[PDB]
């Protein structure tokens, strides 16, 4: 068998557009992993659960409830260098296959982590590591903070400098100028990764064309089982019947598998 680290690692190399899923909970990890995807985004789990230490609880249950590689939506835990490598070390004992540390410090001309600061740590991270295939990727927000192109690329150099596995480069226009703009002046120098959150109408061939390495589905299975929820709830609430949602759900069978 192929560590989930390696798997990931493979992904974020080859030479085909791959694509990750967002998981939020075990059983929608389960779900991500049976529909096909090679790998999932892990994000969403406060809001799930309604919240470092309990975010790692989900994870080692996500982890234990799959078979495909997990890269954390990583946003606590890495305030400091001594927590950043301990980070490293928790998600690696734990399976999970890397981890997506970002730059942001929050929409115009708002804060980024000081590029020299942010640059070691991704190093300090790298240097934690005790499987060599774990993976950290560096998001750059210089975009959506409104820094230009050159400050993107200024920070994913340094990320990619410092040891970091691909740059996840954001944007939240709705097309995908900046990601052009971006690989472009990049001249191939890693892997890319993006989330095309807000630019979702561009064709994903485009994507191809371009040489993005990775496309994040950042969001979704939570917004649609939130959907799900809040719809169900109140038409039984209205109703005061389940015949209106027995026939838009799944058969108790289909839990009982699960």
Not at 74 to 90: E, I, M, Q, S
Not at 102 to 112: I, V
Not at 237 to 254: A, F, G, M, P, R
Request: with cysteine.
């Amino acid at each position: 068998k192929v560590k989930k680290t390696t798997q990931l690692k493979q992904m974020l190399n080859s030479k085909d557009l791959e694509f990750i899923m967002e998981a939020h909970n075990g059983l929608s990890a389960r779900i991500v992993q049976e529909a096909g995807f090679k790998g999932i985004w892990g994000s969403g789990l406060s809001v799930s659960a309604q919240l470092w230490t309990q975010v790692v609880e989900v994870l080692e249950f996500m982890s234990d409830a799959s078979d495909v590689p997990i890269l954390l939506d990583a946003d606590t835990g890495y305030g400091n260098f001594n927590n950043a490598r301990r980070l490293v070390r928790k998600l690696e004992d734990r399976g999970v296959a890397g981890a997506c540390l970002e730059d942001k410090l929050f929409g115009r001309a708002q804060p980024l982590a000081d590029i020299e600061e942010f640059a070691l740590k991704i190093k300090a991270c790298k240097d934690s590591q005790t499987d060599p295939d774990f993976c950290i990727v560096a998001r750059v927000e210089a975009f959506i903070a409104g820094w230009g192109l050159d400050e993107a690329l200024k920070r994913a150099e340094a990320y990619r400098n410092a040891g970091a596995d691909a740059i996840l480069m954001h944007s939240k226009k709705a097309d995908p100028s900046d990601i052009e703009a971006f690989m472009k002046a990049w001249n191939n120098q890693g892997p890319v990764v993006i989330v095309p959150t807000k630019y979702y109408k561009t064709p994903t061939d485009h994507f191809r064309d371009m040489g993005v390495s990775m496309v994040i589905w950042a969001n979704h299975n939570l917004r649609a089982s939130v959907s799900a929820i809040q719809q169900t709830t109140k038409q039984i609430y209205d109703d005061q019947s389940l015949v209106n949602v027995e026939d838009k759900i799944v058969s108790v069978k289909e839990i009982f598998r699960l």
